Amino acid sequence: GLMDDASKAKMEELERRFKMADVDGNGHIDREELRNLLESMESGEVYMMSQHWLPEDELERCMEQYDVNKDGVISFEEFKQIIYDGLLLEGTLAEYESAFKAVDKSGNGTIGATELSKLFASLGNPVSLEKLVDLMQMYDKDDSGQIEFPEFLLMFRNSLLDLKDMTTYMTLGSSGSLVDAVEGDMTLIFSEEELDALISANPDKLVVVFGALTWCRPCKGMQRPVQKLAEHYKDHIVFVKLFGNANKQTKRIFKERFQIRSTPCFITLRKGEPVYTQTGSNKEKLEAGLRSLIANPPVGMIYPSAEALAALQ
Ligand SMILES: [Ca+2]
Ligand SMILES: [Ca+2]
Ligand SMILES: [Ca+2]
Ligand SMILES: [Ca+2]
């Protein structure tokens, strides 16, 4: 009775919303009613009932937090906290589909790390490759090496992205590829399918795989060197970076395909086959080794060593 009118209206609306989510009308929100409430669009007003898209982890994640008394069900008071914390998708299915298509510059229907990097950089918040690893670990939950639509949705649920970033990005032909390398720059990959695509796309260049780990310090020291070699040697060599520990696929590439035992590791592929392997932080040795594979290398070295310089002849 003694609530103010504005508060009474807010509460009446939360009550209306709660009753809507409580589909069976039984007075509360169980785990399976909450699954659909989390799968919904337009602030709980449109349920996508074709089939489920939310991973089970996510629902359990949600009950863990908002079920405070631990009776396996969501009460009205607990439901308010879900609303306040912004868990429901506010946009329409079409707005999320438009945003996904905008980010998927290749137009193949999935978002790769290279695409994510461009989105962040284009919006003035360029991210490091190590941070792209973190984004993929947090959102590529099926270890596909791509962000599919349902995973993109969780970027909005968690406020990593906002539908205004998207409108801005839209303001700023397509290949159809899984990955499109940027000439002169290393490509960070998250799947074997991307590795193979890059090899197939570069039949007449050497492909150098830079294997790193996210906590490896000497690896970090080689990142700037490799960026300079990727520019200098672009007519001859494409570089492809993978962090072995990123996901199930990268672990397998490290252990089964290349048998990488120490990092940083540089594996040079000719027509997809390892022909030259070097490990560690010796830049002079790495570059001399790469150069020895090239008929007509660029003039000048980035990391000369006395030995690597031709005598006056
Ligand atoms: Ca119910
Ligand atoms: Ca509860
Ligand atoms: Ca794409
Ligand atoms: Ca995925």
Residue numbers in the entry: 18 to 189, 195 to 335
Quote the paper:
Herein we provide evidence that Ca2+- and redox-dependent regulation is directly linked within one protein, involved in the regulation of photosynthetic redox regulation and oxidative stress defense. This protein is designated as calredoxin (CRX, Cre03.g202950.t1.1) and consists of 4 EF-hands that are functionally connected to a TRX domain. In this work we characterized functional properties of CRX, which is conserved in the green algae lineage but absent in vascular plants. Therefore, we conclude that CRX is localized in the chloroplast stroma of Chlamydomonas. In this work we characterized a protein designated as CRX, representing a new class of Ca2+-dependent ‘sensor-responder' proteins.
The phases of the native crystal data were obtained by the molecular replacement method and the structure was refined to 1.6 Å resolution. The crystal contained two CRX molecules per asymmetric unit and the electron density map was clear enough to refine the model without any non-crystallographic restraint. Molecules A and B contained 313 and 310 amino acid residues, respectively, except for flexible regions, four calcium ions in each CRX molecule and 1,156 water molecules in total. The CRX molecule consists of two domains connected by a flexible linker region: the CaM domain with four Ca2+-binding EF-hand loops and the TRX domain with one disulfide bridge. In the CaM domain, one calcium ion was bound in each EF-hand loop located in the N- and C-subdomains, respectively. The TRX domain exhibited the typical TRX fold, possessing four α-helices (H10–H13) and one mixed β-sheet. Side chains of Cys238 and Cys241 formed the disulfide bridge between the second β-strand and the H11 helix. At the interface of the two domains, extensive inter-domain interactions were found. There were two hydrogen bond networks between the active site of the TRX domain and the Ca4 binding site. However, it appears that the TRX activity of CRX needs Ca2+, as the TRX domain without the CaM domain is functionally inactive. This is an intriguing aspect as the structure of the TRX domain showed noteworthy similarity to the conventional TRX molecule (r.m.s.d=1.36 Å for Cα atoms of spinach TRX f), strongly suggesting that the Ca2+-dependent activity of CRX is modulated via the inter-domain communication path which is absent in TRX f.
